[PDB]
Amino acid sequence: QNEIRILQDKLNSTMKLVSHLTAQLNELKEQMTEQRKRR
Amino acid sequence: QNEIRILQDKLNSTMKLVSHLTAQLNELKEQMTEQRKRR
């Protein structure tokens, strides 16, 4: 049961990593918007 | 193999920390924008 809980925590960490990747994409979009504003 | 998986998870955590640092930089930029708007 403890191993199953650890696996669930690992899955949650993977979901957090996916959210971090989405945040990185949003940051890239924000950087592009800033570059457009500068021009 | 379990140790290798743990190391991979640690690397993912380090990448998440780098993303957090980028988010902190974005927050600083947002704070600067808010300060400029106030002025």
Curated annotation (Swiss-Prot), chains A, B:
Tissue and organ expression note: Expressed in intestinal crypt and villus epithelial cells.
Processing after translation: Phosphorylated by AKT1 on serine and/or threonine residues.
Protein localization: Endoplasmic reticulum membrane; Cytoplasmic vesicle, Secretory vesicle membrane
Summary of the function given for this chain in its UniProt record: Inositol 1,4,5-trisphosphate-gated calcium channel that, upon 1D-myo-inositol 1,4,5-trisphosphate binding, transports calcium from the endoplasmic reticulum lumen to cytoplasm, thus releasing the intracellular calcium and therefore participates in cellular calcium ion homeostasis.
Subunit structure: Homotetramer. Homodimer. Interacts with TRPC1, TRPC3 and TRPC4. Interacts with TRPV4. Interacts with SIGMAR1. Interacts with PML and AKT1. Interacts with IRAG2 (via coiled-coil domain). Interacts with CABP1. Interacts with TMBIM4/LFG4. Interacts with CEMIP. Interacts with TESPA1. Interacts with TMEM203. Interacts with BOK; regulates ITPR3 expression. Interacts with BCL2L10. Interacts with CHGA and CHGB.
Protein family according to the UniProt entry: Belongs to the InsP3 receptor family.
Disease implicated: Charcot-Marie-Tooth disease, demyelinating, type 1J: An autosomal dominant demyelinating form of Charcot-Marie-Tooth disease, a disorder of the peripheral nervous system, characterized by progressive weakness and atrophy, initially of the peroneal muscles and later of the distal muscles of the arms. Charcot-Marie-Tooth disease is classified in two main groups on the basis of electrophysiologic properties and histopathology: primary peripheral demyelinating neuropathies (designated CMT1 when they are dominantly inherited) and primary peripheral axonal neuropathies (CMT2).
Domain characteristics, as noted in the entry: Composed of a large N-terminal cytoplasmic domain (CD) followed by a juxtamembrane domain (JD) and a transmembrane domain (TMD).
Record's protein name: Inositol 1,4,5-trisphosphate-gated calcium channel ITPR3
Record organism: Homo sapiens (Human)
Record lineage: Eukaryota, Metazoa, Chordata, Craniata, Vertebrata
Residue span relative to the full protein: 2619 to 2657 of 2671
